[PDB]
C-alpha cells in the first residue's frame, strides 16, 4: 500500500456512509412532502364542509325569523 | 481502486443531491407556515358558526316558551 | 490542485451541512404531527356542529 492509498480508500468509505445517511434523509423528507400534499387537500375539503354548514345555518336563521 | 478525481466527482454529486434536498426543505417550511395560518382561519370560522348555532338554539327555546 | 486533505475537509463540511438539515427535518416531522392532530380536532368539531344543526332543523320542522 502506502499511507496515502489508505487514506483515499477510507475517504471513499466515509463518503459511502454519508450517502447512505443522506439517502435515509431523502426518504424522510419525501414522507414529509406526501403528508403536506395531504394537508393541502384536507384543508380544502374542511373549508368546503364549513361553507356548506354556513349556508345551511343561514337558511335556518331565515326560516327562524319567518316562523 | 478509486482515484482522487473519482472520489472528487462522487463527493460533488453527493453535495448536489443534498443541496437539492436543502432547497426542497425551503418549500416545505413555506407550506407549513401557510397551512398553520389556514388552520387558524378555519378554527375561527368554525368558532363563529358555533356561536350562530348557539344563538339559534336560544331563539328556539324562546319561541317554544 | 485537489489534495486528499482538501477532499477530507470538503467531506467534513458536507457532513456538517447534512447534519444540520437532519435536525430541521426532525423538527418538522414533530411539527407536522402536532399539526395533523390539530387538523383532526377541527374536523371533529365541524362534525359535532353538523349534528347540532341537524337537530335544530328537525326541531324547527316540528313547528
UniProtKB/Swiss-Prot annotation, chain C:
Lineage of producing organism: Eukaryota, Metazoa, Chordata, Craniata, Vertebrata
Tissue expression profile of the protein: Most isoforms are expressed in many tissues including heart, skeletal muscle, liver and brain, except for isoform 2 which is only found in the heart and skeletal muscle, and isoform 14 which is only found in the brain, with high levels in the striatum, cerebellar cortex and pons.
Protein name in UniProt: Myotonin-protein kinase
Subunit structure as annotated in this protein's UniProt entry: Homodimer; homodimerization stimulates the kinase activity. Interacts with HSPB2; may enhance DMPK kinase activity. Interacts with PLN; phosphorylates PLN. May interact with RAC1; may regulate DMPK kinase activity. Interacts with LMNA; may regulate nuclear envelope stability.
Comment, domains: The coiled coil domain is required for homodimerization and regulates the enzymatic activity.
Illness: Dystrophia myotonica 1: A muscular disorder characterized by myotonia, muscle wasting in the distal extremities, cataract, hypogonadism, defective endocrine functions, male baldness and cardiac arrhythmias.
Full-sequence portion shown in this chain: 465 to 527 of 629
Compartments, as annotated in UniProt: Endoplasmic reticulum membrane; Nucleus outer membrane; Mitochondrion outer membrane; Sarcoplasmic reticulum membrane
Family of this protein: Belongs to the protein kinase superfamily. AGC Ser/Thr protein kinase family. DMPK subfamily.
Role played: Non-receptor serine/threonine protein kinase which is necessary for the maintenance of skeletal muscle structure and function. May play a role in myocyte differentiation and survival by regulating the integrity of the nuclear envelope and the expression of muscle-specific genes. May also phosphorylate PPP1R12A and inhibit the myosin phosphatase activity to regulate myosin phosphorylation. Also critical to the modulation of cardiac contractility and to the maintenance of proper cardiac conduction activity probably through the regulation of cellular calcium homeostasis.
PTM annotation: Phosphorylated. Autophosphorylates. Phosphorylation by RAF1 may result in activation of DMPK. Proteolytic processing of the C-terminus may remove the transmembrane domain and release the kinase from membranes stimulating its activity.
Top-level taxon of the source organism: Eukaryota
Coiled coil: 1-63
Amino acid at each position: 500500500e502506502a499511507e496515502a492509498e489508505v487514506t483515499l480508500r477510507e475517504l471513499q468509505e466515509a463518503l459511502e456512509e454519508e450517502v447512505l445517511t443522506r439517502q435515509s434523509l431523502s426518504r424522510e423528507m419525501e414522507a414529509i412532502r406526501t403528508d403536506n400534499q395531504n394537508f393541502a387537500s384536507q384543508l380544502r375539503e374542511a373549508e368546503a364542509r364549513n361553507r356548506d354548514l354556513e349556508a345551511h345555518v343561514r337558511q335556518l336563521q331565515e326560516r327562524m325569523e319567518l316562523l
